[PDB]
Swiss-Prot record, chain A:
Description of how the protein assembles with itself and partners: Homodimer. Interacts with RAN (GDP-bound form); the interaction is direct and regulates RAN nuclear import. Interacts with the nucleoporins NUP54, NUP58 and NUP62 (via FG repeats); recruits NUTF2 to the nuclear pore complex a step required for NUTF2-mediated GDP-bound RAN nuclear import. Interacts with CAPG; mediates its nuclear import.
GO process terms (BP): mRNA transport; negative regulation of vascular endothelial growth factor production; positive regulation of protein import into nucleus; protein export from nucleus; protein import into nucleus; protein localization to nuclear pore
Effect of residue 22 to A/N: No effect on interaction with GDP-bound RAN. Increases GDP-bound RAN nuclear import. Increased interaction with nucleoporins and localization to the nuclear pore complex
Species, as recorded: Rattus norvegicus (Rat)
One Gene Ontology term, aspect cellular component: nuclear outer membrane
Protein name per UniProt: Nuclear transport factor 2
Superkingdom of this protein's organism: Eukaryota
Result after altering residue 41 to D: Loss of interaction with GDP-bound RAN. Loss of GDP-bound RAN nuclear import
Phenotype for residue 83 to E: Decreased homodimerization
From Swiss-Prot, chain B:
GO biological process: mRNA transport; negative regulation of vascular endothelial growth factor production; positive regulation of protein import into nucleus; protein export from nucleus; protein import into nucleus; protein localization to nuclear pore
Effect on the protein upon substituting residue 114 to N: Decreased interaction with GDP-bound RAN. No effect on interaction with nucleoporins. No effect on proteins nuclear import
Modified positions (N6-acetyllysine) in chain numbering: 1
Annotated organism of origin: Rattus norvegicus
A GO MF label: small GTPase binding
GO cellular component: cytosol; nuclear inner membrane; nuclear membrane; nuclear outer membrane; nuclear pore central transport channel; nucleoplasm
TM regions (residue ranges): none
Protein name stated in the entry: Nuclear transport factor 2
């Protein structure tokens, strides 16, 4: 009947996450729960409070994320797993490539993110 | 090293050894209902996955992993995410991103979900 439900939920989750992330990241605690984990550039952060503190303490003033590709699959436990490849433009930094993964689980009519992994692509010099 | 990094690191070592040497042996780490998204195309089920990876058009391929990040999920799975570089035959080196969702099924870790993309 056209687009599978994990494609519609994943894609709208990605679009909402990056709108929040580009504009106000203290509002990012709404998509995460107490058991969520975040791995940002190799460092692991357990729990909502440590996740939000970490994303609020980034040194960028202005950030613009652009998605180059997004791939969404259902998992066997009924979760949605998404892989994002994109580009970041922060302040006057040079444009960086990134990869990001999100694991989504339906808890009380809302799809929340239990697991989030982020890593910047390094330029080979 | 935490327990999910030990399992993830071993899975990745196993996957890339088979991928670089004999890709018809890659159905060993997948189950029947695994799903693969390779460069935006979806390959469903073990038989479609192994066909696709066995039929890639190169003879010799070497991957190197640049970064590898591993997490446990609340439902007993591991998420493994990799950034690397590939050298296939005599083509130029290509960058890649790969993601694996591992689940413990019948006492062994298997891949259920696999997503691959080339860095353009």
């Amino acid at each position: 009947g056209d687009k599978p439900i994990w494609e519609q939920i994943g894609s709208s989750f990605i679009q909402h996450y990056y709108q929040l992330f580009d504009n106000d990241r203290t509002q990012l605690g709404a998509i995460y729960i107490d058991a969520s984990c975040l791995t940002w550039e190799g460092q692991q952060f357990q729990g909502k409070a440590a996740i939000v503190e970490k994303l609020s303490s980034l040194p960028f003033q202005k950030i613009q994320a652009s998605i180059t590709a997004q791939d969404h699959q259902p998992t066997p436990d009924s979760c949605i797993i998404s892989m994002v490849v994109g580009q970041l433009k922060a302040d006057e930094d040079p444009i960086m490539g990134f990869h990001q993964m999100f694991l989504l689980k339906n808890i009380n009519d809302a799809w929340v993110c239990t697991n989030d992994m982020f890593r910047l692509a390094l330029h080979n010099f």
